[PDB]
Symmetry: D4
Subunit: 217 residues, 8 copies
């Protein structure tokens, strides 16, 4: 009975609730707009019209029952701030809030929100990376310098071996996976071929990988 309540059904909030529901958790959907509540009614355990800045409505939902509450209101700063503050004063263990700008972040930080999230901003960065470097499909940064990257293989690697493309010595990186025709190879061994348009998961330093990307592929 770990209960989640998602306040604000926007694209971000909507997705969290829709997803949490798919996982088979208990989720309460909360939105001031009636139509939204109708929309996500299928995708939550309970859907309720509520003005989340209004304390008595908030109490009527039985919000003190929830371990996690998500304020997925990032356009209306005042609604967002007021709801978060209410939840803090109502002693909610985890208050996760969508933030709009650096300033909205600060107030939320100050009023005691447990996690502040910038979904647009973060993906903006991620896509910009993929934009400049048309080779990066996906990735994850380990630290400021070290990073795991998923790469779409060019024709300058078609049918080449792991040992052929020596990266652990030649480029200081390690290869972790190949994905060919949907089939997946993990921690692939020294003799393994890589074909054009496969998925390649290289791990190392950011600059090291980009080096490899230059002369390698």
């Amino acid at each position: 009975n770990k209960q989640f309540a998602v306040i604000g059904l926007g694209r971000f909030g909507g997705s969290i609730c829709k997803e949490l529901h798919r996982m088979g958790h208990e989720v309460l959907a909360v939105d001031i707009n009636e139509e939204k509540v109708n929309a996500y009614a299928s995708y939550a355990t309970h859907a309720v019209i509520a003005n989340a800045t209004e304390e008595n409505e908030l109490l009527s939902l039985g919000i003190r029952n929830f371990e996690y509450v998500i304020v997925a209101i990032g356009a209306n700063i005042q609604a967002s701030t007021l709801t978060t503050l209410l939840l803090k004063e109502l002693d909610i263990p985890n208050i996760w809030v969508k933030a709009q700008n650096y300033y909205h972040h600060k107030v939320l930080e100050k009023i005691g929100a447990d996690r502040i999230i910038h979904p647009e901003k973060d993906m903006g960065v991620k896509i910009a990376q993929s934009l400049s470097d048309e080779n990066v499909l996906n990735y994850i940064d380990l630290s400021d310098e070290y990073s795991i990257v998923e790469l779409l293989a060019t024709r300058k690697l078609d049918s080449k071996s792991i040992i052929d493309l020596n990266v652990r010595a030649k480029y200081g990186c390690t290869i972790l996976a190949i994905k060919h025709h949907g089939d997946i190879c993990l921690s692939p061994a020294p003799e393994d071929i890589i074909r054009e348009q496969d998925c390649l998961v290289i791990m190392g330093h950011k600059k090291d990988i980009k080096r490899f990307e230059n002369e390698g592929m």
Copy 2:
């Protein structure tokens, strides 16, 4: 270098432009809202007030020249749609568009957008995984079943060795990295220690990692 046009300086569009500019690419920042143009003036090569649905304004920007055009308008479907169409007829190589819902996705597809992105939806899914599992700090899905996961170490893992935690045989998963106090250990050998509250990077099957999480940590 590479020429990029970012039409619509939202929170998502704005990040792309800000980030790409930090990478030092030629970025044209376009918005109909004057104050947005004024806001991102420091973070672009050229920031211009334009109505991106108005064709003559689009030629006045000289958009035909650009390799990549990003429509970061995702609230106003009509603006988004109408612009993408304009850019298509104008023979732009790569048109990447921010989408709002499944149907706005569909029209973009049908008018031939090159890449459609749902930043909020995708991020929603990500955070939702992090919500039901407090241990996962981050992750990347290699495929429907296989995934590389970043985990926050608990007390059950303090002073534990890689050989002690036999993931490679017991769980079919492999550890890739350990982050201790900001210091970073890549593709670490079996003698190495994991201290609590550190970043642990495991790789394997989804159901297999969850298995490790349960009995392991």
Copy 3:
């Protein structure tokens, strides 16, 4: 049981439904504005308030029953586009859509509308023809060059014969009908008189007719 549904009750949509009803077909009238639905309630088999961009409402009407659906929404491009797309995905055989401008035409074309109609634009042309040439009551173009025209006869034709006004040799046109005092003569024979203010239906080349209009009448 060929069923027609007319979505959007404007002047154009309204007329289609009002007319189709007069013919004794089955017609469903659909408009988001309640008053419109009340208006055309007499002139349809069934009149229903619906927001046609909303799929569940659209399904509740039982729209999959209709062989022909007409989206007579030309001011609101976004409502028009979204409805058409919905209907395409719901596998409607014939989707006829009112278009507003060249661009709205294109998107509709791309999303797979079966016939795009520009009722204002077309009549604008037709009347402009009648405007310059005060003699043309009505007409129909056969091709870019050839055209059937209905003409109001001047005093320079009063009581003249078919043979007198020889057009098949002298002007390369053929006369098809005279309409005098409401009485109608078809394929009128060589001796037939034509009186002032009668209706004359000439068939030929566009330039040929205008020639006739100059020296003839």
Copy 4:
């Protein structure tokens, strides 16, 4: 040549002005919306921003000089009405006005408009005929009962001769034209062939043509 003023650059008004200009007549394009004036600047002799209900602006345009004035305002009854009245008192020869509904028609009639047009309504009727009868591509009504119709030929008509299809005796109707692959056959002789998917132009009584359609094609 002839002087025309088109007040109200709608989709209907706009077409008149665009078309008349292609014919090379002197067309004054008037609208209260600046952006409309800007849009049709290429398609007129003089395009002016004016409030057509304001009398002094109407003298500043010098409208008394024009032979033909077209009020293409059909949404805003008050603007339409008030303007027509202004033009009447200003002794304009021909005032043609776009009408919205039967009552807006009535006032225009009563304030002495010279020609009232319902472009959407009329076109609605036309398309509706085409809807119930997929064969009719176009048509012109000579009177309440007699009409010239353009038909799309089916398989039942392929390789058929004009003498084979005796319309002149069997159905009281006469064929006027055949269009094959863009090529055009006018007032064709009895030996001529009709191939499927061609344009066929028949003339007669309405009920008679429908009769031919039924058993013939």
Copy 5:
């Protein structure tokens, strides 16, 4: 059973109905605004919310029963015009309409309104007369030259006689009434005194009276 219906409850319309009711006539109060209908509910025989431009509502009131209908809508020209036209077509014997400007007068005149009234304009004149000439309390014009005026008497007439102030010979006017301390004297005889601040009713030529006003009072 002479029935009156007052459509439009403004200051002017409201007063007509309120007054007609006081006289003990049958009056129907009609206004689109519900509150107005509530207001005049006491002051009419029947008060009904109706949109007077809507024919079926108009028919539901049973408007064809009324000998006199008053359209007391002078701000909204379009509502006024449309209602009047409706009433004309519904064959109402007397249609009295409040007009706003010279143009609104003309259309009403043309569509066949039986009496057009300019309540503001008329009183504006009347008060302006009283303004310049602080002596004129009230008056009524007989023709362009001849006029009956009510006058407040100065100290230069206090205790003077009818014969003393000879106006029928000296000024070509005739005196008709004196009103002293509320008591009224009619066709007052040659010996009658007039005191300061009495009411004096002089009849004659406009210029004649003003002459009297100069040297007399």
Copy 6:
């Protein structure tokens, strides 16, 4: 001559200014609406854009100089009230204000307006008298009971003599004027004829005139 300020160029205010200007008095026309200032520019000595509630603007107009100030604002109570107060504190001799309702009258009274006018209300009463009695063209009430009335002559009065119609004895009323075909007969002698459709001017008691109307005409 005399200085007048007309604040608020309504239909009522506008008439005062237009009329007073025709009389050739110095009239200052003030309105907050620019287009009103532009409209009455021809009909005043000085027409100025001003917010009459703003004190400094009121000194910039130099209103202290004027003998008469007319507040012809009767829809906007707050504007009306606030202005009148401003003018009072500014020691203006005569403040005449247009009032909307009984309570707006009351405040004006209490803030010391010199004359309060209800043009619509008063005119409403007048026309209402004319409605129930088609014979009364015009009138003036001398007091609660005594009144001078202008009557439209019927068939019952055609070719009738003043001596024949003994009003002075039979009805206690006196005839004052006869208007025949525009020609005017003042204080007419007993031999004089009244022809039908002429203006008749009777004087007496209200109930007495109605009495004459009934049996007389």
Copy 7:
């Protein structure tokens, strides 16, 4: 049964009613906005939605029962004025009204409001005093010159005696109270210590106190 009614529930009005209720008086809460009425429903004897400018609603509340009525509407001048006037005419003994500016004060004064209050303006002054003089916690003016002030004691008074800080001779002021650690001493005697950060209540001339504030503390 001294009844109070608070019309207008703003911050000021709300506080009056909330407070009067705490005291255990009978209070009627009145606001046009429904939500406000719901808000103060707990904090009044009776809470009622009413438009206070509407007389019949006002009468339905039974407003003639109240000894005191408070019009706590200071933003909307017209609503405030109209309500006050209504209450005057309904013969309410005490009409206390919140005023917005000097002008709104005047009209209220003129229409006979019993007390006019400027809550913002007054506190603005009070705080500005505390602002310049960081030593003044609170105070009360006796007249234009004489004033009782509460003062926060500096380190230049820590552990000093009443006789030590002789003010009745040295500065012409008298000390009335010390407040130390919450404990209160009144009319404190000559030997009494004063510690840093205590509360000191000095009484005298305004200039006298400020003198003391300079060399004393």
Copy 8:
């Protein structure tokens, strides 16, 4: 001298600025509304149009220099909040903010405002005391129980001596001042007379003063 910035020229903010300026301190008057800047131009050292939430505008005002900044925005929570935060990060010594409700208070507290004021609420309490007790003209609370009160003398107190009214023993309270006809008697001796309608200033316990009021006056 001391530098003060008053952001938001409300009725409360406006008074602070007007008063502080009368005291002759350097006051910067900031508002987003141009007309407010224009209004208080006479009552400040520098009056500037600025959006106080916009950071660059805040540096353009040079706000870092000021010792005291007052946020007198209390309707617009978001503006208020966002500004206070800006000023905090900009290291301003004293930030005094006007608050609207308990929750707007809370955020200000949490973002570290130095003093939060509720001018309406506080004043509401004050007047409410004056309402239930017509005798109290003014007062100051020394603590929860002890208070100095200004009283309006009744008939029961006329010609009464300080010794006659033994408050110091009978009621535990002490009289501090008597105001007679504007003349002022400070810390008055026992022989002194109180005449009716004078200001009386008593000091003691709250319940004790009420006791005196009951039996005394």
